[PDB]
Design a protein around this ligand. Structure first.
Ligand SMILES: N[C@@H](CCCC[NH3+])C(=O)O
Ligand SMILES: N[C@@H](CCCC[NH3+])C(=O)O
Lengths: 484, 484
């Protein structure tokens, strides 16, 4: 209780002493090795080898543990690559350093060490220090469960598993890029600020551009811009970046990372194949196996995902459903309301059926699953099905009961797109706050001619969860949006 | 004039006919080669070789030119990789296709072709088509100078040089990532929406989070978050993404791409070296040479950048300056005002001197140049110089008379950081609308201990300009913010 306030006072006082001696915060020590490198190269060597090799190295990091035993001490130093042992002895260091400096430092302090590699009696790799310095005085001791999110730096210092999660996120993004580029896709950057938001249905964030006296929107999706690029001739493009949806912070984050990709002369079937390869590749290359453990489940990304139509999923998860009800507006509305769905005045049959699917099946799609036949009403940007114009060549895919991706054969029929935008404008007029805005320039782009194309959006944060056994999106986002 | 309205009517009518025949917009044709691949592999082969090799391929793209000559025609097809010639003959295609379909198509139409490779009498690589299809009817004919920005898709269809510019941008970003990762840097993602904006000085964009009834800011820089990651132990991190500054759209874009990188146990000198290697590497790997032509200049990224202190730059570009004036507030204010700078009440000597440097020297820094010794007043996040506390270990670097990067040894002195934040709060109270907000959590992070570190921000859009001979930032941003 009070012992903490003493740690603080003690560290301040030690800092005051440093200031009196000269420059309290230097920037001069240079390391030439991180712990992981030392382990990779030297863990397999016994003390006899290291003795003859006589390898001197320099490391730096946070002093995590210290056991002072008179004339000698043992320190665990934690850097970007993990931890390495330091053997700190009075007579190995320059005169006075051990007793007048080292012993006065505190756990949490950033230190630098140079010395010779060897192995302890316990067989651990260690550095027999010949030089040791205090680089940064830590004014605070080493560290609900919200603290992890409000002070992620404390989470990263303390928890090896949190660190590994974020290192894996970076490995996954790099591997996605490598996967995409190998398939001839080119990464592009489209606006975050848009005059007309689109490419999805969501309440947007609005901001005022002080200069051009205009109201701008943070993007809910880059879709309409990416398809303009395909019209332009960039027939294989992808973008990995944020979308912003003014929903709630219900562990949901207002901003999240999405990858969208478009490939001309392909349909949704090609996206299905690409999705399966991507997951199999990521699992194999990043995790070492195609069988991934997530909670109480195992996902085999080496086997094809399940494929069901939206109606098959509804029937499978609410077997008592009279499927004929989904063909009649009144019946579908009644069914929807009976399962707790508030049916808005603007909704049509296709929207109601989709909402029923969400309520009924989504949570149960645990194993990787593609759900096809999304109604036209809820897919204003998707190609109509040749046989039944009321459904589109669109799928969403789910893993662990969450939506991971959304893909479709793109609507390249400009006149149809205009009509569908108009319907969305009518829906907003009828109360649909999330309906799409009419985008004339986008229609114009389609009039110049969009090649037949397939596009896919994949929630990167959700994907990261599945590969790191995280069960809240907040565990894979470095700095989650936190309530004040 | 009226001939355009006829093109439109004609294309609509042809589309109407397509609709009557069946599905006007199919998604079925699959290609197996792009033009660039065909050229790479087959340009060096003469007609004798191609005749015996008898290689059949499938391509698809926009019909750019067509010369109909009775029973045979020549078409230029433009895809993602460039252009390839098609030889379209009545008797080579299935019955009726040539006369009843092909001849009725229009330039701009997206078409698919399968056929055998050969070389024309002119020595050009061409495809003797055996199958040809209309994939997408173009309802509009092929395309101030603002149109390029308002309809970038038209710019990309029409101008090979615009395309190449954006292909190079993507190559540069990929090469930057490859350069960074090779040096042990890990790419991370920090928030675009922040409760407290910081890491730079600029008027921000504000947006309301409908849910959490809170006002949020689009980030002006990710700096404060990235340094929290270094405290956390991610000692080599970088982020490449947008910043948003509510300035003007004076060809300046409200949102732009920046790379920020941080490396612990390094100072600004290491950033200088990294900057030089990065540019030399990018030029060599992407452009094929270290000597880069930009406008009327040539930049040799194979030779060290020039290095001048801020004062040396002022003296060099306004030689008549009595340098002693920069040591006296009144004198400096008078000097500043005499060159047209409006000196605000909140400004101190360091700010005035920096403003003088901007007015006097910035535009003249054509050859790659580092400018050191930035005053403390204008560098609230930078490490103080050991000898003179009123300047910081900070530099900015310029090329082509524009600021390309900003880097410094990081301030890891928590108590100093708090004081400097307080000064920034005072500056805002005194009228500085762009002054930094006090960030308590950031100070707390520094109290846990930030290793000595060097950080650098590089304007990616400006960098792209220098490598593509573009002279407005709008030429390297796919969809520039355009006035309504
Ligand atoms: N824009 C979609 C992803 C791409 C769908 C195919 N065009 C979304 O935000 O869900
Ligand atoms: N945050 C700086 C770049 C990094 C400077 C070094 N910490 C900027 O926006 O200019």
């Amino acid at each position: 209780a009070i012992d903490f306030n003493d740690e603080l006072r003690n560290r301040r006082e030690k800092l005051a002493a440093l200031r009196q001696q000269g420059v309290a915060f230097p920037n001069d020590f240079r390391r030439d090795h991180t712990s992981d490198q030392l382990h990779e190269e030297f863990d397999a060597k016994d003390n006899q080898e290291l003795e003859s090799l006589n390898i001197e190295v320099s490391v730096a990091g946070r002093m995590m543990t210290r056991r002072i035993m008179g004339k000698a001490s043992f320190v665990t130093l934690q850097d970007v690559g993990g931890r390495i042992q330091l053997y700190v002895a009075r007579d190995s260091l320059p005169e006075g350093v051990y007793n007048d400096q080292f012993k006065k430092w505190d756990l949490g302090d950033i230190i630098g060490a140079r010395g010779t590699l060897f192995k302890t009696q316990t067989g651990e790799l260690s550095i027999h220090c010949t030089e040791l310095r205090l680089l940064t005085k830590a004014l605070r001791p080493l560290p609900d469960q919200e603290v992890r999110y409000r002070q992620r730096y404390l989470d990263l210092i303390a928890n090896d598993k949190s660190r590994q999660t974020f290192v894996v996120r970076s490995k996954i993004l790099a591997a996605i890029r490598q996967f995409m580029v190998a398939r001839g896709f080119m990464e592009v950057e489209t606006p975050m600020m848009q005059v007309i938001p689109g490419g999805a249905s969501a309440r947007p964030f609005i901001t005022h551009h002080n200069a051009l006296d205009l109201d701008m929107y943070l993007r809910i999706a880059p879709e309409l811009y990416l398809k303009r690029l395909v019209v332009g001739g960039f027939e294989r493009v992808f973008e990995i970046n944020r979308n912003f949806r003014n929903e709630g912070i219900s562990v949901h984050n207002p901003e999240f990372t999405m990858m969208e990709l478009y490939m001309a002369y392909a349909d949704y079937h090609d996206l299905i194949e690409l999705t399966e390869s991507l997951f199999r590749t990521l699992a194999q290359e990043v995790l070492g196996t195609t069988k991934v453990t997530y909670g109480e489940h195992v996902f085999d990304f080496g086997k094809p995902f399940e494929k069901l139509t939206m109606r098959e999923a509804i029937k499978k998860y609410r077997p008592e459903t009279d499927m004929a009800d989904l063909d009649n507006f009144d019946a579908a509305k009644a069914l929807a309301e009976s399962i707790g769905i508030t049916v808005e005045k603007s909704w049509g049959l296709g929207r109601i059926v989709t909402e029923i699917f969400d309520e009924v099946a989504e949570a149960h799609l645990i194993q990787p699953t593609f759900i096809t036949e999304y109604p036209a009403e809820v897919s204003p940007l998707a190609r109509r099905n040749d046989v039944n114009p009321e459904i589109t060549d669109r799928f969403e895919f789910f893993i662990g009961g969450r939506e991971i991706g959304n893909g479709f054969s793109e609507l390249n029929d400009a006149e149809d797109q205009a009509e569908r935008f108009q319907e969305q404008v009518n829906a907003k007029a009828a109360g649909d706050d999330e309906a799409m805005f009419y985008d004339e320039d986008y229609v114009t782009a389609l009039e110049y001619g969009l090649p037949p194309t397939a596009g896919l959006g994949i929630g990167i944060d959700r994907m990261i969860m599945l590969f790191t056994n995280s069960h809240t999106i907040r565990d894979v986002i470095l700095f989650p949006a936190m309530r004040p």
